Design a protein around this nucleic acid. Structure first.
Lengths: 89, 121, 53, 43, 119
RNA sequence: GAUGUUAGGAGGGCAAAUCCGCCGAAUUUAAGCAUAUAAUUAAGCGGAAGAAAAGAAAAUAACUAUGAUUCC
RNA sequence: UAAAGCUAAAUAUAUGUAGGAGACCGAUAGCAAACAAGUACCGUGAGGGAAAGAUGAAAUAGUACUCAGGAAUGAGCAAU
RNA sequence: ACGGACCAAGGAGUCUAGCAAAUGUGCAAGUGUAUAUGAUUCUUUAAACAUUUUACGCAUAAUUAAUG
RNA sequence: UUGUGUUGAAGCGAAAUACGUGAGUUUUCGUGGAACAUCUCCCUAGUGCAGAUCUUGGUGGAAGUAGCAACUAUUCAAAUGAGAACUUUGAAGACUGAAGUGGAGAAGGGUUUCUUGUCAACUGUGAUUGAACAAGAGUUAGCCGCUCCUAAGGGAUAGCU
RNA sequence: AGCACAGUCUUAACGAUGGAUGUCUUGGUUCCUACAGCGAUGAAGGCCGCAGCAAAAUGCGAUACGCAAUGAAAAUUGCAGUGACUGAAUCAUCAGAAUGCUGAAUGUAAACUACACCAAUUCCCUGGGAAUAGUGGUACUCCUACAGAAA
C-alpha cells in the first residue's frame, strides 16, 4: 500500500550492520554476530582465498608502508655486523 | 659499449639522467676548459661554480663573456651576469645557457678544488 | 575425421598450457656449467676433477 | 547522530581536514575532494 | 644553532638543562606563531633541529653507558643482545654443525682427502 | 602425576612462483548417458627451504650381467 | 636381506627484489593502472573498479599598455 | 521478411603437436647430429663453428595369436 | 642495396591536359614543424572493413517541440545593487488551524552551525539569496547520558570429536 | 545612396564543436641472469599524527618530508629564512639512536581511547636530591632445572 517492495522499502534503511573492523580498517565488520568479512577479526588468519585474484593482490604485502621489511632489505649486500660503525676521520 | 654490466638502453638511461640526484648532476654540469688552461692544468674539463669566469661560444648570444651568478641543477642551467633579458612585465632576469655551449677561461681556485685537480693530476 | 588420413592419436585432451615449458636457456646453461666446472677444477690446485672408473 | 564515539569523531575531523582545498602558492610551482551532500563518506 | 661534536663532550646534567631551556624557547616561539604574529616563524625549524640533535647525542651516550654497565655476564638484556633474523638466531652454531663423532673424525684424520697429479 | 607472574627457552601470524600431505568436485567428451574421460586437476585445509622431496636396494635383469637418488 | 635414521650435485620457479636484453606494444594499443592507481566511484557485503600523456628552445619569454564595458571579455596604433 | 540515424578508430580461418599429400633442396643404402661435450667465440654471440675407428629414431624383409 | 631531409619531411584538405582496367601510384597549392622510403632481392606479421540489436568516443533530425500542473494567493512603496515577479524592510490581504512546515529528541547524515566576503559552475526561470564557493570561528558536566547489573543470547575456558 | 521572394538541396572558399590520422615516450610486456623469508628482540597490514606558510602522493614516528656518522662536498629557495670562504645548505650510503596506538596481540572486552592486580617508577649527582598517577609485569600450550604437598 505505502511501504511497498520498492521505494517504500527503501525508505526504512537505518541501523547499519558493518563497521570499522579494527584490524582491516575496511567497513566489513558485521555487528550482529561479532565477525568481520574481510579478515575475520575474532579469528586468527587473514581469511585469504585463491578464487579471488583481486582480493589477493589488492591486499597482498608490499602495498603498505613496509616499516621493518624494507629497512631490513638492502642490508644483505652489506652483510655488516650489527653494532659496528664506520671508521671515523 | 663492451661491458654488459652497464646498460645501454635509451629508456633505462635517459630516465636515470632526468631523475638523477643533484650529487650526480654536479658531474654533468661541467663544460670545456679553455685552451691555455688545458695545457696549464693538464686537464680537459671541470664543473662550474657560482663565481667562475666563462666565455659563451654557442647560440644567439655567443659574443660576450662574464662572471656567472648562479647555477640551477633543477633546470640544468647556468646564469651569466651580463646577458640578462627583460620580460613583458618589465622585470629583467638572466637568460639560461646549457653548460655544453660555454668554455671556462678563469675559475676560482679553492681548498675543495685543489684536491680534485690533484686527483685529475 | 576426413577420409584417408591416419587415425588421430593426439594425447592433448587434458590441460597442457599449465605444463608446457620450452627451454630457451640451453646454450647459456651449457656456458654456466662450463664456467662452474672450470672454476671447480681451478680451485683444486690442478688435480683433475675426473675419477677413474 | 548526536551521540558519537571517540574514534568516529576523530575520523570525522580527519575527513573534514581532507576536505580542505589545495593551497594557492603551491600551485605557483585538486581532484579527490568530496561534497558533504553529493558523496556519502559512509563511516 | 649548536653542532654535534661541540655537544659530544658535555656533562649529562648540563645537556638535560640545555634541552629543557631549548624546549621552553621552542614553546615560546610556538606561542608567537599561534598569536597574530607572523614574523619569527623561521627560527622554529632551527630550534626543532637543535632539540633533535641534543636528544640524539644524549640517547647515544646513555646507550653506551648502559652497555658498559653490563659487560659480558652472558645475560645481556634482550634489546642489548643481537638483532639478527629469527632463523639466524635459531640457526645451528657453526661449531655445533661442524662437531662430529670420534669414529668419523678419526677415520677422516687417518684417510684425508688428498691432492695428487698424473703424469 | 599435580601446583607454581619459580629461573632459563620455544610455538602462534604474515608472505607462495617452484615444493610438501590430506580432502576433493563438476563444466566437458563419449556426438545421448550411467563405466570411463575431464583428474589422483580446479577449490579448501595444514607445513618449510633457497631449493625442497628422493635417496645407499627386501633393485633390475636373465645376459661375457649391471649397481644409491635426481634430471635431459 | 624389509618392517629405524641421515646427506651436497646434477634439477623449478606466472613470488619478492636487483641487474641486462628484444625482428614485442606505442596512449581505445601495452599490465586494470605511462598521470595523484588498486585512486575516485558503486554496492550495507562477499566484492566490482574506471577516464585522464605532448604550449613553447627558453615561460629566469605565460600575455605588460591604451580604449570600451560591472566584470567577463573584446579592439588597437600597444605588446612575447 | 530481419540489421542498418550518422561519423572516426578497433574488429574475425591464427598458433602449437602429429600425420599425410604436393612442391623445392642436400645427401643417398643410409640418413638426422639428441641430450650433451671444446673453444685466446664469449657488446652484437640466447649464434656460428667443431663431434678419436656400432647411441638411438626412421629404412634396409615379410609374415603368424604364438614358441618362432 | 641507395637516398631524401630547416631552402620543411611524415600527415592532412583541395586538386591534377597525370598513369593503370584496378586495387592504387605519382604530383601541384595551402597548412605543418621533425623525420621519411626503398619496387634492387628477400624474411616476417596482432596487416587491408559498411554492416555483426559489433564496442568505444563524438554529432544530428525529431526540436526551440513535449514540457516546466499537486500542497487555495498574492499586491503595493522603499532600500540594496548597474541589474529585483521569486533578496531585505514596512503596509495589506491570507494560510498552516496545536494529529501544525511549533518546540524538543532517537537511528542516519558529519560541519550543512555562526560571522565576514562571495557568483566560475549549481540553486532546472531570474537571481544581489543560499543547504554553492572563500577565509576565520564554534560543542566546557562529581549531578544530562554512556561507563554498572542482569534477558531472550553471543564469544570463549575443561573435556569430547 | 541603390539592387536583391523566402525556404530546401547541391558545389567551392573561409571558419566553429571533436581529437582520429602522423610523429614523440621517465611506460608496459616477454625473455635471460643473480639472490632470497619475516616475526613475542613485537611481523605484514591498518588507524593516528609530522612541515613557517602544507591538501594529495612520496617520505617520516613526539628526534615525526628528517637525527648521528662516512663520502660528494656549496647551494636550498614559490616568499621567508638557513649556509663556508668546510662533521654545517644540498645529495648518495646508512651499521649508531629512536621507532606513537594497534595489529598472531598476549592481564580482563571492544561501536568503550573501559577496568583490574603485583612491583610505586624514573631521572640527576657519585650516600643523597629531585620528579612524576607517569612506568614495567600479569594470555594459552610446551621442554629442561627448583620448591613445598600426596601414597
Amino acid at each position: 500500500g505505502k511501504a511497498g517492495k520498492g521505494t517504500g522499502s527503501f525508505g526504512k534503511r537505518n541501523g547499519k550492520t558493518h563497521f570499522l573492523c579494527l584490524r582491516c580498517g575496511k567497513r566489513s565488520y558485521h555487528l550482529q554476530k561479532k565477525k568481520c568479512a574481510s579478515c575475520g577479526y575474532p579469528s586468527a588468519k587473514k581469511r585469504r582465498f585463491n578464487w579471488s585474484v583481486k582480493a589477493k593482490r589488492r591486499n597482498t604485502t608490499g602495498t603498505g608502508r613496509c616499516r621493518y621489511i624494507k629497512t631490513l632489505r638492502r642490508k644483505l649486500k652489506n652483510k655488516f655486523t650489527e653494532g659496528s660503525t664506520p671508521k671515523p676521520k | 659499449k663492451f661491458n654488459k654490466q652497464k646498460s645501454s638502453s635509451r629508456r633505462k638511461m635517459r630516465k636515470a639522467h632526468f631523475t638523477a640526484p643533484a650529487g650526480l648532476r654536479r658531474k654533468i654540469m661541467s663544460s670545456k676548459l679553455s685552451k691555455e688552461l688545458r695545457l696549464k692544468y693538464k686537464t680537459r674539463s671541470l664543473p662550474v661554480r657560482k663565481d667562475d669566469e666563462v666565455l659563451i661560444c654557442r647560440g644567439h648570444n655567443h659574443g660576450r663573456e662574464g662572471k656567472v651568478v648562479k647555477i640551477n641543477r633543477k633546470r640544468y642551467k647556468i646564469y651569466v651576469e651580463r646577458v640578462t633579458r627583460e620580460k613583458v612585465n618589465g622585470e629583467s632576469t638572466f637568460i639560461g645557457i646549457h653548460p655544453s655551449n660555454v668554455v671556462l677561461t678563469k675559475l676560482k681556485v679553492d681548498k675543495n678544488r685543489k684536491k680534485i685537480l690533484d686527483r685529475k693530476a | 575425421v576426413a577420409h584417408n588420413n591416419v587415425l588421430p592419436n593426439v594425447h592433448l585432451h587434458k590441460w597442457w598450457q599449465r605444463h608446457v615449458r620450452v627451454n630457451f636457456s640451453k646454450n647459456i646453461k651449457k656456458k654456466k656449467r662450463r664456467l662452474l666446472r672450470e672454476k671447480r677444477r681451478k680451485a683444486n690446485g690442478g688435480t683433475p676433477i675426473e675419477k677413474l672408473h | 547522530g548526536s551521540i558519537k564515539r571517540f574514534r568516529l569523531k576523530q575520523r570525522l575531523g580527519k575527513c573534514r581536514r581532507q576536505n580542505r582545498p589545495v593551497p594557492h602558492w603551491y600551485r605557483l610551482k585538486n581532484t579527490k575532494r568530496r561534497h558533504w551532500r553529493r558523496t556519502k563518506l559512509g563511516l | 644553532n649548536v653542532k654535534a661534536y661541540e655537544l659530544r663532550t658535555l656533562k649529562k646534567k648540563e645537556l638535560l638543562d640545555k634541552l629543557d631551556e631549548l624546549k621552553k624557547e621552542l614553546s615560546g616561539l610556538r606561542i608567537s606563531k599561534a598569536l597574530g604574529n607572523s614574523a619569527k616563524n623561521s627560527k622554529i625549524h632551527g630550534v626543532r633541529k637543535n632539540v633533535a640533535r641534543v636528544l640524539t647525542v644524549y640517547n647515544q651516550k646513555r646507550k653506551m653507558e648502559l652497555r658498559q654497565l653490563y659487560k659480558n655476564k652472558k645475560f645481556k638484556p634482550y634489546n642489548l643482545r643481537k638483532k639478527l633474523t629469527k632463523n639466524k638466531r635459531l640457526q645451528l652454531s657453526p661449531k655445533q654443525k661442524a662437531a662430529m663423532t670420534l669414529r668419523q673424525k678419526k677415520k677422516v684424520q687417518n684417510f684425508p682427502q688428498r691432492k695428487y697429479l698424473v703424469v
